[PDB]
Ligand binder design. Structure first.
Ligand SMILES: *[C@@H]1O[C@H](CO)[C@@H](O)[C@H](O)[C@H]1NC(C)=O
Ligand SMILES: *[C@@H]1O[C@H](CO)[C@@H](O)[C@H](O)[C@H]1NC(C)=O
Lengths: 112, 94
């Protein structure tokens, strides 16, 4: 999708950094100390991504053909593609754990 | 053609392998890394874990696995390159 470049309030991915120190999570998160989570922002006029999913494509096909109530639904900037990310943190029994947590970083933003 | 040294000190509890070579898998156009985490009680090093690490900029362009943080309780390490976690070092950035 698109990255936010200001002025234009279209659905774009605005960068955002999360510091575990800030939210008080560094006491149980050994690495990393923070990461680029990002989020989606922007108005959606009349599925508005670049590479959607099968479901969004089928419904979008019904939208671009006039079949309602799809022409009576909201469109909102939401994450379309989500990336995993590695983390080294502490278990509930103070055990060092490494996991490839899913749905960690927003990569693409589209309109629902 | 990308792999990292694998070691899990908690092999018994987790009921997984203790050593071996882990192949690194990552999305296209996304980098791959190796990581190493150990303890350094008064000079005697005790490795905790070693293996593959997902795409992380903090690991970009680093053929050496070094811990640049100042005196942590658990030392961490990440790098780019096959078996780059084979060895690790400590060089705090002041
Ligand atoms: C774990 O170890 C067993 C025995 O050496 C081996 O057969 C298996 O492939 C290993 N699995 C991984 C993921 O390394
Ligand atoms: C920590 O380990 C490194 C080698 O990785 C070593 O150079 C350093 O002296 C160790 N720290 C202490 C306090 O001995």
């Amino acid at each position: 999708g698109l990255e936010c470049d200001g002025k234009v309030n279209i659905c774009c991915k605005k960068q955002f950094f999360v510091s575990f120190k800030d939210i008080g999570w560094n006491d149980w998160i050994i690495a990393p100390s923070g990461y680029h989570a990002n989020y989606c922002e922007g108005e959606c006029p009349s599925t508005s991504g670049s590479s959607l999913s099968f479901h969004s494509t089928v419904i979008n096909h019904y939208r671009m053909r006039g079949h309602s109530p799809f022409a009576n639904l909201k469109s909102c900037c939401v994450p379309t593609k989500l990336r995993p990310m590695s983390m080294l943190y502490y278990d509930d029994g103070q055990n060092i754990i490494k996991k490839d947590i899913q749905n960690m970083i927003v990569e693409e933003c589209g309109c629902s | 053609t990308q792999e990292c040294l694998f070691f899990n000190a908690n092999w018994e509890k987790d009921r997984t392998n203790q050593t071996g070579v882990e192949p690194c898998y990552g999305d296209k156009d996304k980098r791959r890394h190796c990581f190493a985490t150990w303890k350094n009680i008064s000079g005697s090093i005790e490795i905790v874990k070693q293996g593959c690490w997902l795409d992380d900029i903090n690991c970009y362009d680093r053929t050496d696995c070094v811990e640049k943080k100042d005196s942590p309780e658990v030392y961490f390490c990440c790098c780019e390159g096959n078996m780059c976690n084979e060895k690790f070092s400590y060089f705090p950035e002041m």
